[PDB]
Amino acid sequence: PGSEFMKFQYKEDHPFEYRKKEGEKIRKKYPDRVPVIVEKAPKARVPDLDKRKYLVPSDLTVGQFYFLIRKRIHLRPEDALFFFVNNTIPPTSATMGQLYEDNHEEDYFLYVAYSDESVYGK
């Protein structure tokens, strides 16, 4: 009850220095995009996406990114879905670039989890 640490398989599978090289290479090669890892939250009976690493246009809004991911995920129209970045639901009107700037980790990746619940891990 309360918060829970967001675990990402991408961080389990790749050492920090590997992730930081990739994050920096991406930011150098595609300055108008932000690298984003998208994985499921625990206890949610939802699909994995076909892939977890995304290069997102910086000016795409969070609302638009939600549209694309919700369409990509294999879910029924009645299924609820919420995004979490650093344990909080991001603003719909934010750009992915702003969200990235404020929330990316030391490896220069932004981490997004999704769940059918409105609190991460519940």
Residue 85's DSSP bridge partners are: 88
Q: CA–CA distance from 54 to each of 41, 76, 109 (Å)?
A: 17, 23, 10
Method: X-ray
Residue 55's DSSP bridge partners are: 35
Q: Is the dihedral of CA 96, 62, 47, 41 positive or negative?
A: positive
Q: Locate tokens 């640490």: which residue? A: 5
Closest C-alpha to 98, from 90, 106, 86: 90
* Separation of CA 114 from chain center: 8
H helix and E strand count, the chain: 4, 4
Q: CA–CA distance from 110 to each of 1, 78, 97, 104 (Å)?
A: 25, 28, 10, 4
DSSP H helices in the chain: 9-13, 16-29, 62-72, 96-103
3-state secondary structure of 11: helix
